[PDB]
């Protein structure tokens, strides 16, 4: 008779209990959920980021009734993951699986702690869909959350995150492939996290219809790029609003949604080869992924007065003033240097520090004059006023 | 290790996504569902009928990204099929099975789009029971509907449609087996629809209490017919309140539910055998399937003027009136030519054509009379009133 | 404009509301004789009557794709753009052929067809290649998009 037991019993301890305790800062909370041990001799162990999320103790429970206090080594909200670390010896673990290899259709049984039990629950299904989650038919309610996901042959090929459904099973979980766990898990183990970078790229989904539209085979296949913002790595490396991404370092791109999905998982520094074809020309490009926070920053030091604004040229007869010659406020970035100052959306500029202010251009060659300060003049509506940019 | 992927992965194109757009004559709607392709050299495909309602719009997306403009041959709800009809080539299909060869317990994987994506979701489970559904514990949500049940070997065997259960999966789908599925296709790929025909035939479940009661062995098989009503095929063919049906054309009949499946699938003009017990006789029948229009056409100048009431003798001493003696009309069907011309229930009819009328068949040998109208004199309570009745 | 009416036909015109009066009752096809008023010089036209949905489809047909959308130049510095040129799309028929396609009222239309879109006439222009389609290269917001106008 067939049977799946005979590989779930080798691995079973391999997945754990962890129950949480806290406070939400927006009230006490217990929050149960599941685990895997990663590396029996190290003690490292995967889950949820969403599980241990404001934990002060993570009490994790291996089958054996050992109830450990347990670390937390890093956790990446973003992928929703955390890696775990536990003093005690004597743990058991799994094989880690190649989530690529798998195929909707596989069997597959899911490993975790629904509702309460303290010694753990397992439950079969197929694969169901391959997004950047995986899909299973395979049981999956509260509680599942940070357990393991094993193929026909018990493998370790994902960890289970969430349901579609007042949420019971309704037979459609989530799994994120171990592959991005592996790498996930190092990044967080070796860096203690992990630095996500910037690239300066908006890309949009080939439809067919498209791929046609830009004198290419109804099944070309890639990733459209719509922008490439300005004094970002993308436009760098040299790319274009319009090319056609087809290929990222090592993985192919088939849909707009894996560009994405390959990138933020490359650390700050990461140089990433980027082949896209143009004009039915292919040509690869390199592209640095930069610091978000630094290049924020530079690019506030480069505009430096007028960094957070948005901008236009006016002319208008406006009483009381006569006829309006300036820039038009259009925006304001509420943390920017300039809305810090006075200037609020509507503002006309017509001068800055004493001189005529006429286009953007007339203002900007203005911002130019290196100084500590730019002494602005504005009007809002019948009344002016004059405010000191720093 | 087993897998179910081997064969999905040739089969996954056949199954396509179904969105509908329009308004609802009692509103826009999206209604999103899936289908499935049968004919991949002409784009026959199949799908529920409740899906593709009030379309203007039918957009088909096939694996490859293709969107394409869908068209409705044509779609009986009383079956809740729709044939469609799509003009893109290099198309792929899977083998249509044999609904008939399926037996409880055998494993089955659902394919369709449960909420969204745009490439396809696939589900496991076995078959539950057969009854005219099939039901199946392999997931099936909102989304599933229009697209493929398939056997462990991957040929369609069935069309699932609805769920039991405020309503997810809790493992409980109904699909349409497959021999029904191709049966209602041609006809409405050829005839471009379905003519559904009349019987006058009412027909119960043989419980072995009855059989037994009717002098059979509590094993016995069949339907009993509990009614045949006048002038229908049922009667013409030479059948008759209990009689049990063991056997129509082809199918053998073990249920009541299966008479009313197998006939209302034969088109108008068909021919059916029916084997009938008969006080422990067994006797072969023919009746021919007619035209519900028609028909209803047809005892409507059979007896004219008439038709549409409910008629009964009436004899009472009634204030002012004396001693009534007419009939009684004791229901009118409101499209009636009696309550067009202003009988309503109640009346008594104590004239007609200057005759005294005295019980029902003194009238309706009045009615007999050869003219354009009757000529009809009524009470209502208290008072009286002529009314012609054309 | 400024013409002053005189007469329709046979009909002489005395009021404003008499026109439209007038006119509803001639059947399409008719070829009215307007005798129009321009300077003191009166001077008499020639016009043909048509049907209110054939002349829809004259609007339609004239006009490939931008049937049904207001549109003026744009220019503005704008994060996380840097400075946008094109030309911004003020309104867009609930029924016009890129409402259709996609756009939406306040999309800046930086590229059509491949090319730079800067006034309103460059974009008209591209909008004349003998072409099945109009890929209009939109922004909104901090974001763009490209979308298939047909």
Redo the contacts between chains.
């Keep these: 008779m067939?049977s799946m037991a005979p590989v779930l019993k080798n691995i079973m301890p391999a997945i754990v209990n962890v129950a949480v305790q806290g406070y939400l800062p927006n009230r006490k909370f217990e929050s149960i959920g599941s685990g895997v041990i990663i590396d029996p001799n190290n003690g490292v162990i995967i889950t949820n980021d969403h599980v241990i999320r404001n934990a002060s103790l993570i009490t994790v429970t291996l089958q054996d009734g050992r109830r450990l206090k347990a670390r937390l080594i890093g956790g990446d909200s973003e992928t929703d993951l955390a890696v775990l670390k536990i003093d005690a010896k004597n743990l058991k673990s799994l094989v880690i699986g190649d989530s690529d290899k798998l195929?909707?259709?596989?069997?597959v049984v899911a490993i975790g702690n629904p509702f309460g039990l303290n010694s753990q629950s397992a439950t079969f299904?197929?694969?169901?869909?391959l997004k950047n989650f995986i899909?299973t038919?395979a049981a999956i309610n509260p509680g599942n959350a940070g357990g393991a996901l094993v193929?026909?042959?018990g493998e370790l090929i994902g960890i289970n995150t969430a349901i579609?459904?007042y949420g019971?099973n309704?037979?459609?979980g989530f799994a994120i492939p171990i592959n991005m766990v592996k790498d996930v898990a190092q990044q967080i183990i070796k860096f203690g996290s992990i630095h996500r970078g910037l690239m300066g790229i908006?890309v949009?989904?080939?439809?067919?219809?498209?791929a046609q539209?830009?004198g290419y085979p109804?099944?070309f296949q890639g990733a459209?790029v719509?922008?490439v913002?300005?004094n970002s790595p993308a436009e760098l490396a040299g790319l274009k609003?319009?090319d056609i991404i087809t290929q990222i370092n090592d993985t192919k791109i088939t849909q707009a949604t894996q560009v994405k999905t390959t990138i933020s998982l490359l650390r700050v520094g990461s140089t990433v080869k980027i082949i896209v074809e143009r004009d039915n020309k292919p040509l690869t490009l390199s592209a640095v992924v930069t610091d978000i926070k630094s290049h924020e920053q530079k690019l506030q030091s480069n505009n430096p007065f007028l960094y957070?604004?948005?901008?236009?040229?006016f002319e208008q007869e406006s009483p009381p003033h006569g006829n309006v010659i300036g820039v038009q406020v259009?925006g304001a970035?509420e943390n920017s240097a300039g809305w810090r100052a006075g200037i609020r959306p509507g503002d006309i500029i017509i001068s800055a520090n004493k001189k005529p202010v006429t286009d953007?251009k007339s203002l900007q060659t203005i911002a130019q004059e290196k100084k500590k300060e730019l002494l602005v003049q504005v009007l809002r509506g019948p009344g002016s006023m004059y405010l000191l940019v720093i």
């Design positions: 067939p195929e909707v259709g596989d069997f299904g197929i694969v169901s869909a899909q038919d193929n026909a042959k579609l459904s019971g309704v037979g459609i908006f949009q989904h080939l439809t067919p219809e498209l539209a830009m109804e099944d459209l719509s922008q913002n300005p609003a319009g957070g604004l948005a901008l236009r040229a259009v970035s953007v």
